[PDB]
């Protein structure tokens, strides 16, 4: 779950990190209101989930409050590589001396989470990991000690960041304990900023939670549904599907994450498009080939639908009333390819005869299918 | 086969559970030997003719045990597992989906440190052919023959085996190590066993988008593999930054891109079916 | 710092452990309104600092708002083996099925923290540390780890408690969080109770925070003045002295706990009886030597002043520098007893001679010459 | 001597603070070998002729240390204590007053796992008569000679050691081991160090009320000792549940009781002097 970078300034202030003042303002007249109370150069910047909102044209300074509200009026509703800003933060500017990087992920190869930290802050930490990983110091954290000052002292030093040495310390220890406090995947301040007063600021921070750890984190789990990259993916939740939107036009249900990125290449590879990554899980009754197929044609993309379901003791025609039901509710509007292993295939065919419902016994042939077809209503 | 066989005295914890309950039945029809069910709060139960206590130690203070399955929800599945560990039990098997990366993180660590092997957590089990089920999977796809399996998913690695099966090459130990980024057991912590059976000849390796278990696994099979290996990437045209389904199928950047997967199998001279027909085929070839 | 049944039950219900509804009253109307409010049997609970509240008569039951008005009129201002109730927690009453006792200390010779755990609760968890020390069981957490439900159920079930097994053994891990949490030294249910409906709550609950680690607990660190056993171990706090109201008339100060322990020993030995401990730190100047006699003074028990010194290198008219400007300001109005070693010690005689205030080369010739005062 | 002598190199933790440039300076004039110090935020400068270093970590980079002395703040010193034994440093010395007790508790776990020997904290520290002083003890009192101290006080300490130097007895190496509840270093962690020391021909236990190290003490005494102690207990006329001064003199109902230490004592048969004098004569006495 991604969280706004409002959201993540307010967990990092919580535990102890130094975060300039901001508010969230959903029109220009809010962010007056808000420059006016600040009484001082303020940012606008962008509340969306992507990164690179700068380049993009996102983050403006603003020196009065006529100002913050005409920036505020070029931002919002602005696209930032795919987004529509619905929200800016209305922030005090600080004075910058020094920007650097300080980041927590998993590191899956050592199976401890790493602090990455570099002089080379207020940049695509991407690149420079590829370009020059010299520059880039880590630190593996004990998952049961956790991160001491002492530990902390030592990578400030070892990054060479110059600046109040205790201070730098304790917002990465600050940082972690945040990581861990709210079980982040990801939490990064970038840049971490010295000001010209010599004070130690977060000047913007991403926080990534995981998902897995939601159910105790009630305060969280509540922005679920308005972090949402696509509002599927809440209603596919609700079945204990997984749903991602992808672009193009062919829908996907399979029966396995595995099986699924395994339709997903077949599509692709001959040519097709895929609309979506569906999970419907372990098992593959009727219920749920239904609510799959619910959840999959609320999509205005997709063009047709791709069931690739391997039951091995769950029966074929499980699957096949369940399309039927939906077809014969009207919902069902476009075509549906399906390959469905288990027991009694023939059962199953003779059930889908007059109905635009055709199985294949392979995958490759049901996947050739949708990817030629011409989809839509029928 | 590796690590079970028929003689394995089996501990189901959560049993009294719907999941539980389900896979016990399914488990017990294919022979598997369940002496005993832990449920915190139904001890003195009895479900499908096994006994039930409270606690692993109440359990094994009356059973032996040789592996425990674990279909505790995901909120106390961590915990299980460490209880499971602490009880002595060798091989832990970790069923449950939705467990905290930092439940894992912390558990795997303690676990290891005490002797345990755990597998898990989300996935499907382990199974060896015609000997023993200790897990979700269909006992009906897996016919005894010649060939170890180690996949990162489930039904995926029931239809390479199905498809083994019906080619006359059948299966030895297919272990699910799970979907999650930590887990308990990796592909080369099992390639050693699966090295030194004389009844697997050869080895196929299921993996996907993220980490890099599959790099590790093929440097590891370069240099000590006596047997020929087969590999498969799920994921391949998979986008970066997102989970696709597996807590762990996910491109960070520059870790866990299938590209890197795929060179560093080819590196290693295992080849890299692109089908799950390809996977017989090449396994065909590789046996004479 | 000692905290009330109130406060350690409110940081106890912060980390999820189940505690009946209460609130504290100060007036006998004010518990009567809370009655009303709850609308159910209630009990009335003297807040005081000492165990055995039950036994003194600080604990009553009260069925109606009239009840609870005249249980808290009958117990606000009682005495309770020293102390004097000034406020009441008017709390629901629970329906009592079992009683458990819980607690964690620090076992210095494990170097841990230790879960004590027993079915005999609402007992002197001491006493049954003799008739049968069996009854209580221990487990000893690891410092980094923490403690985990799995261990809490498996002290559960070694314990042999009746109830639900997962929310018993789920109040010991968060009575665990909680003793980290504020710094306690000591944190303890006793009753920990099943109710005859299968609820478990924690009818009663006791903690002791460390001291050392107020400075991290702000909320907490406020209560300090008021938590004080005496009024004095706060303006000795403020000079960083260290004092401890004993009853007796003799009263004392040295530079050096392990120092001044031995002082009261002397003083006992021969007969005295030591008003106080004051330990002014590690080193004696005059400054502090005053401060001291400040703080000691404001005591009406003490009679005259034993002051035991080693400065080694500190220069003894340090001490009688102190003592006389005490003396010329009209603080010191009791006699002084002194042995101040260090350089210098004659000069210091020529300093104090006249004056009520006796120096002698020995410690115990001191101690002895206040005994008769 | 035991632990350290006029060879050990010193580093002082919290040097720029005003007590570490006070018994910097002390330790200096005493022949104490001080070669470098660490302060967070103040390294690259200078005290007293000793260059300071941001960590130990650099320090011990530019510099030999055979242990080191901690003058950081409570809430910062227990982190300081393991930042010295992540460094390496064999011997390290934590004077501090005040730190949290679980800090300790986590700290001296780590601490000794890493191999390090921790003294204090709430200590004046370790001094060997007229070779080192680590430490605030006053160097005077200390006349070298036959006499090994162990104390878990301070002041009272240099007054035995005065009145066993004026005696004529003198004294070897004297370790204030704290006042706190949680110590790294015990009674009978330096009694067998004592006890193979040529140089020491009779040890001093100054204990108090509270915890039951005088009584472990005690029990090695009576198995393992090959020379006479003398014991010594401040507080025995402290009342219970009261601190007295040190965190860690307290009496807890049935634990740390005067009479307790005074019962195993003699059963050790360990002489215990009511006085200073008495100290200096049972010694005397034991010395033929
Ligand atoms: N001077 C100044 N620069 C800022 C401030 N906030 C952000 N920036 C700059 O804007 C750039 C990008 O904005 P950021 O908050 O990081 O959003 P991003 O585009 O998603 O990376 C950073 O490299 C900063 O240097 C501010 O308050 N004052
Ligand atoms: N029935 C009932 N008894 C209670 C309740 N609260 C306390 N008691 C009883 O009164 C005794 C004394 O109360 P407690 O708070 O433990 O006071 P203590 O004497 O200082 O330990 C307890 O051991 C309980 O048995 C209650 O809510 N309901
Ligand atoms: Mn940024
Ligand atoms: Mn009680």
Same mark, same amino acid.
């Given at each position: 779950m991604n969280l706004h970078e409002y959201q993540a300034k307010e967990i990092l202030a919580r535990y102890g990190v130094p975060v300039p003042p901001g508010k969230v303002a959903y029109t220009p007249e809010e962010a007056k209101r808000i420059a006016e109370e600040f009484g001082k150069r303020v940012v606008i910047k962008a509340q969306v989930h992507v990164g690179g909102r700068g380049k993009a044209g996102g983050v403006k300074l603003a020196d009065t409050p006529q100002e913050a509200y005409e920036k505020a009026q070029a931002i919002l509703g602005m696209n930032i590589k795919g987004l529509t800003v619905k929200k800016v933060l209305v922030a005090e500017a600080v004075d910058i001396a020094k920007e650097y990087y300080a980041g927590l992920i998993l590191d899956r190869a050592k199976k401890r989470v790493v602090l990455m930290l570099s002089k080379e802050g207020g940049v695509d930490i991407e690149e420079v990991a590829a370009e020059r990983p010299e520059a880039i110091h880590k630190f593996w954290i004990d998952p049961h000690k956790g991160f001491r000052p002492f530990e902390a002292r030592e990578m400030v030093k070892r990054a060479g960041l110059e600046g109040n040495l205790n201070k730098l310390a304790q917002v990465l220890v600050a940082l972690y304990r945040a990581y861990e406090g709210v079980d982040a995947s990801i939490a990064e301040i970038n840049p971490l900023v010295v000001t010209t007063d010599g004070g130690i600021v977060a000047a913007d921070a991403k926080i990534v939670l995981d998902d897995n750890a939601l159910?105790?984190?009630?305060?969280?789990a509540e922005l679920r549904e308005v972090e949402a990259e696509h509002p599927l993916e809440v209603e596919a939740s609700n079945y204990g599907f997984a749903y991602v939107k992808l672009d193009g036009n062919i829908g996907i249900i399979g029966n396995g994450a595995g099986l699924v990125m395994y339709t997903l290449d077949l599509v692709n590879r001959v040519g097709g498009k895929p609309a979506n990554f569906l999970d419907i899980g372990g098992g593959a009754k009727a219920d749920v080939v239904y609510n799959a197929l619910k959840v999959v044609l609320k999509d205005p993309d997709v063009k047709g639908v791709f069931i690739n379901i391997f039951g091995g003791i769950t029966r074929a025609d499980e !699957?096949?009333? %369940? !399309?039927?039901?939906?077809?014969?509710? %009207?919902?069902?509007?476009?075509? $549906? $390819?399906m390959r469905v292993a288990g027991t009694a295939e023939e059962e199953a065919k003779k059930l889908l005869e007059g109905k635009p419902v055709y199985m294949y016994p392979t995958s490759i042939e049901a996947a050739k299918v949708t990817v030629a077809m011409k989809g839509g209503a029928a | 086969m590796i690590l079970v066989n028929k003689e394995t005295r089996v501990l189901v914890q959560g049993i009294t559970g719907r999941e539980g309950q389900f896979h016990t039945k399914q488990m017990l029809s294919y022979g598997t030997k369940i002496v005993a069910g832990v449920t915190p709060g139904k001890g003195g139960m009895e479900v499908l003719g096994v006994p039930v206590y409270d606690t692993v130690k109440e359990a094994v203070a009356h059973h032996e045990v040789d592996a425990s399955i674990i279909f505790v929800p995901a909120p106390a599945a961590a915990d299980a597992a460490l209880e499971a560990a602490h009880a002595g039990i060798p091989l832990i098997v970790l069923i449950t989906e939705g467990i905290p990366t930092l439940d894992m993180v912390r558990a795997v660590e303690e676990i290891k440190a005490?002797?345990?092997?755990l597998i898990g957590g989300n996935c499907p089990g382990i199974i060896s052919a015609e000997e023993t089920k200790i897990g979700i999977m269909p006992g009906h796809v897996f016919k005894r023959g010649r060939v170890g399996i180690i996949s990162r998913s489930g039904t995926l690695t029931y239809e390479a085996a199905a498809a083994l099966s019906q080619a006359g090459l059948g299966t030895t130990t297919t272990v699910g190590i799970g979907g999650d980024?930590?887990?308990?057991?990796?592909?080369?912590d099992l390639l050693p066993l699966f090295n030194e059976d004389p009844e697997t000849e050869a080895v196929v390796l299921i993996g996907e988008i993220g980490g890099s278990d599959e790099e590790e696994a093929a440097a590891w099979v370069k240099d000590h593999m006596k047997k020929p290996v087969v590999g498969f990437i799920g994921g391949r045209s998979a986008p970066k930054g997102k989970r696709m389904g597996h807590a762990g199928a996910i491109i960070m950047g520059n870790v866990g891109t299938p590209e890197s997967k795929l060179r560093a199998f080819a590196e290693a001279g295992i080849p890299v079916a692109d089908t799950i027909d390809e996977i017989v085929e090449l396994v065909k070839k590789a046996l004479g």
């Open positions: 159910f105790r984190h009630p305060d969280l !699957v096949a009333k %369940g !399309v039927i039901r939906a077809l014969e509710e %009207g919902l069902l509007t476009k075509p $549906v $390819v | 005490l002797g345990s092997r980024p930590v887990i308990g057991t990796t592909f080369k």
